[PDB]
């Protein structure tokens, strides 16, 4: 009867911040809650874990397995992005900040479900509602999470309610908000010590458009040109990738948080599909796509409107 | 830019209560906002709207007629339970105490579900939440839609924090919680002026149970043994609808709303596969289902068991 807490598939700062942030009320208000994680933290989560100095979410995989038949979904809600065996278990509440799709439950349930920056956010008005008060590590990874969502809120994502929370999260982490928030940001910048595999999985989402399983990656740097640098074993490993998992198209967005721009690298079956969301020419399989810095709303719904559906 | 507010497809007392009241509240936050219906009122709903003199919403009919492109649900998320052109709008909110399904936007929206008796107990707590004091008569819808989802707190469906919810409504709708109750409900038992085929169809709802096509009606009353006066002219509404509708059974429940009971009454090719549901023996071609007053809760198990899975 341990409820489950947990973000989606490839989780990044806001969907590990948002599911501790959320277990912890949970517990609070007297559920026997635990968060976890879908997979092992990328870089600037783990850059936010260390600061605070708390663990990792322990990695499960399988609801089931772990002996769980209910879960608590923050910052998704598609079944895809889920875990493995979500449709065997059933979902008592979920916090999110994305639109629904592919969900569904067989009973009643809670859901908050806000149109702002970051999941993260939302859990916030949570913890001031229930009067609940919010401990300095549970500031920092909820402050992280939304920084991380909205590009220390910079983000054509930031709500205009995002900058009171990231303040006085800011204040109850005991962190200067620019300061905290540009070195948090850099450290996902850490390319290097990943593969080429890696890297193109860090932070992807599949998504259907108009009958085209397409796979959109992003990644942030300091330079594009940097990490251009190893194209080839990504295209490689981008090509690998599309092969295991059955896409017709693979977007690698890279994008450079110091300059807001990104660098669009797509391979496979509709890369003028591509050129024609953005109206550019991809040269050596990449373009520049300037002022670009959200995969939701600076590309996918160009390459929804190209792709059609 | 004028949302419609609406609750579902022939809309009980929570349905038209949370839609007005939700209206309400979203003008009072600056949000032009508007409480239409998708069908008149019932015996019940009429009875509140008088009690508190305010007329019944407007019925319409479209979205894109009523020059509107945004709207908000309450008491529902289901799409064949909604508004005709509801694939075509804009869904901005949803107020909902009900599972998911059938349900999909583009775009984040705000969503605020809660597993609780009534959706008209969720608006209540979104009016204190947002500061605005609960109008005489809107308490009084809402009130109306609590008590009557929830058969006056006796129904399984009952949640912990409703009580104290219906209390604080009736204190500020000006009414006694239990007298206003249950004259309200006894209000809207009007039977008699239906005819038999009508009856069997005011709120029913079909099942596949391993390849049967099991049809399950509801009829409140005060009083069962009167609508047992009219058991021959029903069975024959039923045998009628099983014949137009393909049904193979047809389990009507004759929910006696003051006591908690349910006669059932079945009639088809498995009228066993309900015995064995409900350990009881159809004497008559109808068995006593004590505790009965809610359909999923207390009757479609059982049935889904007995034709089992
Ligand atoms: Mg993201
Ligand atoms: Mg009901
Ligand atoms: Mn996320
Ligand atoms: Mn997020
Ligand atoms: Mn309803
Ligand atoms: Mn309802």
Same mark, same amino acid.
């Given at each position: 009867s341990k409820i489950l807490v947990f973000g989606h598939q490839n989780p990044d700062s806001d969907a590990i911040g948002s599911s501790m942030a959320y277990a912890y009320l949970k517990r609070q208000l007297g559920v026997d809650a635990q968060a976890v994680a879908l997979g092992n933290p990328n870089e600037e989560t783990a850059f936010v874990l260390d600061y605070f100095g708390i663990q990792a979410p322990p990695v499960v995989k399988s609801a089931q397995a772990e002996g769980a038949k209910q879960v608590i979904l923050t910052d998704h809600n598609e079944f895809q992005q889920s875990i493995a065996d979500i449709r065997e278990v059933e979902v008592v509440e979920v916090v999110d900040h994305h639109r629904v799709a592919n969900f569904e439950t067989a009973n009643p349930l809670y859901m908050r479900l806000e149109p702002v920056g970051s999941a993260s956010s939302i859990v916030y008005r949570?913890?001031?509602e229930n009067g609940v008060a919010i401990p300095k590590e549970i500031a920092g990874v909820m402050l992280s999470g939304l920084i991380s969502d909205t590009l220390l809120l910079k983000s054509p994502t930031t709500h205009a309610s995002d900058p009171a929370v990231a303040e006085d999260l800011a204040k109850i982490a005991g962190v200067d908000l620019q300061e905290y928030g540009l070195a948090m940001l850099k450290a996902g910048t850490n390319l290097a010590s990943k593969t080429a595999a890696q890297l193109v999985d860090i932070d992807?989402? @599949?998504?259907?458009?108009?009958?085209?399983?397409?796979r959109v990656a992003q990644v942030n740097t300091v330079d594009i040109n940097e990490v251009l640098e190893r194209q080839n074993e990504?295209?490689?490993?981008?090509?690998?990738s599309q092969a295991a998992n059955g896409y017709s198209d693979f977007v690698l967005m890279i994008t450079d948080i110091l300059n807001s721009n990104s660098e669009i690298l797509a391979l496979g079956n509709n890369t003028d599909k591509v050129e024609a969301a953005f109206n550019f020419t991809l040269k050596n399989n990449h373009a520049f796509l300037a002022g670009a810095v959200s995969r939701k709303?600076?590309?996918?719904?160009?390459? @929804?409107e190209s792709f059609n559906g």
């Open positions: 949570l913890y001031k992807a989402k @599949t998504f259907e458009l108009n009958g085209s399983q397409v990504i295209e490689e490993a981008i090509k690998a709303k600076q590309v996918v719904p160009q390459l @929804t």
